[PDB]
Amino acid sequence: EEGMRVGVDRNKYQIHIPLPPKIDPTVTYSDVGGCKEQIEKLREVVETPLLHPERFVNLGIEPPKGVLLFGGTGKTLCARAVANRTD
Amino acid sequence: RTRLLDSEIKIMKSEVLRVTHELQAMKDKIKENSEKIKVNKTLVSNV
User: Fold this and answer.
1) Closest of A18, A13, A24 to residue A3, by C-alpha
2) How far is it, in rounded angstroms, from Cα A41 to Cα A35?
3) Pairing of strands A15-16, A7-8
4) Of A41, A44, A87, B28, which sits with the fewest C-beta atoms within 10 Å of its C-beta?
5) Residue A4 contacts residue A19 (beta carbons within 8 Å)
6) Is residue A26 marked as binding?
7) Is there a binding annotation on residue A73?
8) Could you tell me how far CA A67 lies from the centroid of its own chain?
């Protein structure tokens, strides 16, 4: 697969036994109720598809499954209040 | 029809010439084209 440091001949440069020695080490809630209005939309988008694909599927609308958040706002604290709730 | 023998001689000559073209082209092309492919296979640059 292109973008991998693969084994390759020293003379003919034909591909040989590969390896990605670049490996995994590259990537690193009582606050439920914060900025008020945000809480309900977050709750819906997270749980209602995770819990009840009926409020939308039967409604034909789609399960809210994403958020275009924008903002000391707390972009992580919201994700953690969700971690209280996702599972 | 006396020219038929000379025509047969010329036709055998044309057959030998086609076979010689076959040799000089395909047989030598084995070598030449194989070297070209080697350069292509065994191992990008600007005009």
Assistant:
1) A18
2) 11
3) antiparallel
4) A87
5) no
6) no
7) yes
8) 11
